[PDB]
């Protein structure tokens, strides 16, 4: 079983090195995804600003929504929106039939506060034919599980036909209890390109 | 022993993915730690990393003490301070009872020079009640072992009471022999929030 042990370990490491999933992330920014920032919820306003100019304090924010489609997930490299409801609009690197989505949050063991009450809880994913489309097409309703693993994968609804999308909206309906804000570390979109 | 093997591998990978320790780092910059740069030793200044633009020499690059509380530990991504002893003051993201500290350095096998004589050797960690206190309460005396693992953990002194700190000073009293500078890759602070 020794060679089998080496094989299992190498398999696990290989998968780990392939962005933990072995699957294309069509939302990944460096690979061609982009946040459509004029359609996203407003970034959470911190108490203090980053600088001042002519006596006026400027920039009351921590991270832009871009971090949601970048891979670093050390604590704090997340996009915070106000309250417990919000949305993020992402243009994918290709036109795809979406098959699955990934949400990551930090583990409870790495949270300075001891909890991850700011993690998204109930959410849905919609496909948009245009970024100004008012009502999207539901791709799925899901819950991120604070007692589960840091990285969680969710299966898209099985469609009779196949409509392709290059824009997706993530709507968060709730968080795990933080009153001030919700923090999104990473959202991935998987599927088959047309 | 196969399912047990998969469990062991997943357990090891999970720990690895949690900043290699599974413990909050209250010094980590992205989570809210910051350097008090006016209370750090002098940075080592080489004029040898030249940044240019369109061929025009522009400025000479050197790493700031901020990299000590950032996770990248590829060779060179360290703060080099002048000489073989020095100090760094770090403000933690929370008021904590400090329990342990971690120091990382590159392994010798990755060092272009063949050695890690620039690594910290003898050091101490003190808790400061305010940013102007010079010595503080000794939290522990330690040695980073150049023949040991890249990442090393050190337990804080057990004291009858529990005083909380949000500022800790790392004093490096010696390095592993480099005459010009000492290079700090990463320092972490672990403990219990108040």
């Amino acid at each position: 079983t020794e060679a089998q042990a080496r094989a299992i370990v190498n398999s696990a490491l290989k998968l780990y090195s392939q962005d933990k999933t072995g699957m294309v992330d069509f939302a990944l920014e460096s690979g061609g995804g982009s946040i459509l920032s004029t359609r996203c919820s407003e970034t959470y306003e911190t108490k203090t600003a980053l600088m001042s100019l002519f006596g006026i304090p400027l920039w009351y924010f921590s991270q832009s929504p871009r971090v949601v489609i970048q891979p670093d997930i050390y604590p704090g490299n997340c996009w915070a929106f106000k309250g417990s409801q919000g949305y993020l609009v992402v243009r994918l690197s290709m036109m795809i039939h979406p098959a699955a989505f990934t949400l990551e949050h930090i583990p409870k063991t790495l949270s300075p506060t001891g909890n991850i009450s700011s993690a998204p809880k109930d959410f849905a994913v919609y496909g948009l034919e245009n970024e100004y489309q008012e009502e999207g097409q539901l791709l799925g309703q899901f819950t991120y599980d604070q007692d589960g693993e840091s990285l969680q994968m969710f299966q898209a609804l099985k469609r009779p036909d196949d409509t392709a999308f290059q824009i997706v909206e993530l709507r968060i309906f709730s968080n795990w209890g933080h009153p001030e804000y919700t923090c999104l570390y990473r959202f991935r979109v998987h599927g088959e390109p047309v | 022993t196969e399912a047990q093997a998969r469990a062991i591998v997943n357990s090891a990978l999970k720990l690895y993915s949690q900043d290699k320790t599974g413990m909050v780092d209250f010094a980590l910059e992205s989570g809210g730690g910051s350097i008090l740069s006016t209370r750090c030793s002098e940075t080592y200044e080489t004029k040898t990393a030249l940044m240019s633009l369109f061929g025009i020499p522009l400025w000479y690059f050197s790493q700031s003490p901020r990299v000590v509380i950032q996770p990248d530990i590829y060779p060179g991504n360290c703060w080099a301070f002048k000489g073989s002893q020095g100090y760094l003051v770090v403000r933690l993201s929370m008021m904590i009872h400090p329990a342990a500290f971690t120091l990382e350095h590159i392994p010798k096998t990755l060092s272009p020079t063949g050695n890690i004589s620039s690594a910290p050797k003898d050091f101490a960690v003190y808790g400061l009640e305010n940013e102007y206190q010079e010595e503080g309460q000794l939290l522990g005396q330690f040695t980073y072992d150049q023949d040991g693992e890249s990442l090393q953990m050190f337990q804080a002194l057990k004291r009858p009471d529990d005083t909380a700190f949000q500022i800790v000073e790392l004093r490096i009293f010696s390095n592993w022999g480099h005459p010009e500078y000492t290079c700090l890759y990463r320092f972490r602070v672990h403990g219990e929030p108040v």
Partner: peptide, 13 residues
């Protein structure tokens, strides 16, 4: 003039 600000309060996590 341009003038950075310290935060003194922890970021969202």
């Amino acid at each position: 003039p341009f003038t950075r600000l310290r935060h003194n309060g922890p970021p969202p996590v």
